[PDB]
Amino acid sequence: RKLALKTIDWVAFGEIIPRNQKAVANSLKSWNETLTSRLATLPEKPPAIDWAYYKANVAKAGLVDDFEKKFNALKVPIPEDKYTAQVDAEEKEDVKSCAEFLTQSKTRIQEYEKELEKMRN
Amino acid sequence: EVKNRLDYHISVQNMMRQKEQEHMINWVEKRVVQSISAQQEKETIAKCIADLKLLSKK
């Protein structure tokens, strides 16, 4: 429903925890699994009442019918974000990860390989 | 939560109607069960149909 795999993730996750969150992720993994199995189970929506039987055969229908109208008119919101600029601090952390490590390290490796030439000998 | 309100009223009316039904029934039947000697002919029709048994069984 709500989640998905992105990359390689529930396994590939847990092992690997950037130090600036590292400790958190260990705890967070197990929390997530709890949410995962829970959500998958729940019902998604109930039935929606057979009015015909109830209206006819609950003959206090002044009450029933008024409550009916209020129920049928009854509108519903959604839950709330709170925690999803983490989603976006992601693209930031993704810079840090590649370019910030990618680049500096690629220049480092540049030297290690050029030095490989002579030390064949 | 919507159902919970409704079915209570239905159930109460249903049980209430049975507790009327029984209570009226025994009271009516326990009052009026007298006129059998006044109208004998519920046993005369017993003997009528009973003659159409005593003849019409075999």
UniProtKB/Swiss-Prot annotation, chain A:
A Gene Ontology biological process term: proton motive force-driven mitochondrial ATP synthesis
Location of this chain's protein in the cell: Mitochondrion; Mitochondrion inner membrane
Quaternary structure and partners: Component of the ATP synthase complex composed at least of ATP5F1A/subunit alpha, ATP5F1B/subunit beta, ATP5MC1/subunit c (homooctomer), MT-ATP6/subunit a, MT-ATP8/subunit 8, ATP5ME/subunit e, ATP5MF/subunit f, ATP5MG/subunit g, ATP5MK/subunit k, ATP5MJ/subunit j, ATP5F1C/subunit gamma, ATP5F1D/subunit delta, ATP5F1E/subunit epsilon, ATP5PF/subunit F6, ATP5PB/subunit b, ATP5PD/subunit d, ATP5PO/subunit OSCP.
Gene Ontology cellular component terms for the protein in this record: mitochondrial inner membrane; mitochondrion; proton-transporting ATP synthase complex
Keywords attached to this entry: Acetylation, CF(0), Hydrogen ion transport, Ion transport, Membrane, Mitochondrion, Mitochondrion inner membrane, Transport
Positions carrying N6-succinyllysine: K75, K82, K92
Molecular-function GO terms, alphabetical: proton-transporting ATP synthase activity, rotational mechanism
Name of protein: ATP synthase peripheral stalk subunit d, mitochondrial
Modified residues (N6-acetyllysine): K29, K45, K60, K69, K75, K82, K92, K114
Physiological role: Subunit d, of the mitochondrial membrane ATP synthase complex (F(1)F(0) ATP synthase or Complex V) that produces ATP from ADP in the presence of a proton gradient across the membrane which is generated by electron transport complexes of the respiratory chain. ATP synthase complex consist of a soluble F(1) head domain - the catalytic core - and a membrane F(1) domain - the membrane proton channel. These two domains are linked by a central stalk rotating inside the F(1) region and a stationary peripheral stalk.
Family: Belongs to the ATPase d subunit family.
From Swiss-Prot, chain B:
Transmembrane segments: none
Residues annotated with N6-acetyllysine modification: K30, K42, K53
Annotated compartments: Mitochondrion; Mitochondrion inner membrane
Family, similarity comment: Belongs to the eukaryotic ATPase B chain family.
Primary role: Subunit b, of the mitochondrial membrane ATP synthase complex (F(1)F(0) ATP synthase or Complex V) that produces ATP from ADP in the presence of a proton gradient across the membrane which is generated by electron transport complexes of the respiratory chain. ATP synthase complex consist of a soluble F(1) head domain - the catalytic core - and a membrane F(1) domain - the membrane proton channel. These two domains are linked by a central stalk rotating inside the F(1) region and a stationary peripheral stalk.
Subunit structure as annotated in this protein's UniProt entry: Component of the ATP synthase complex composed at least of ATP5F1A/subunit alpha, ATP5F1B/subunit beta, ATP5MC1/subunit c (homooctomer), MT-ATP6/subunit a, MT-ATP8/subunit 8, ATP5ME/subunit e, ATP5MF/subunit f, ATP5MG/subunit g, ATP5MK/subunit k, ATP5MJ/subunit j, ATP5F1C/subunit gamma, ATP5F1D/subunit delta, ATP5F1E/subunit epsilon, ATP5PF/subunit F6, ATP5PB/subunit b, ATP5PD/subunit d, ATP5PO/subunit OSCP.
Protein name: ATP synthase peripheral stalk subunit b, mitochondrial
UniProt source species: Bos taurus
Gene giving rise to this polypeptide: ATP5PB
Whole-protein residues included: 192 to 249 of 256
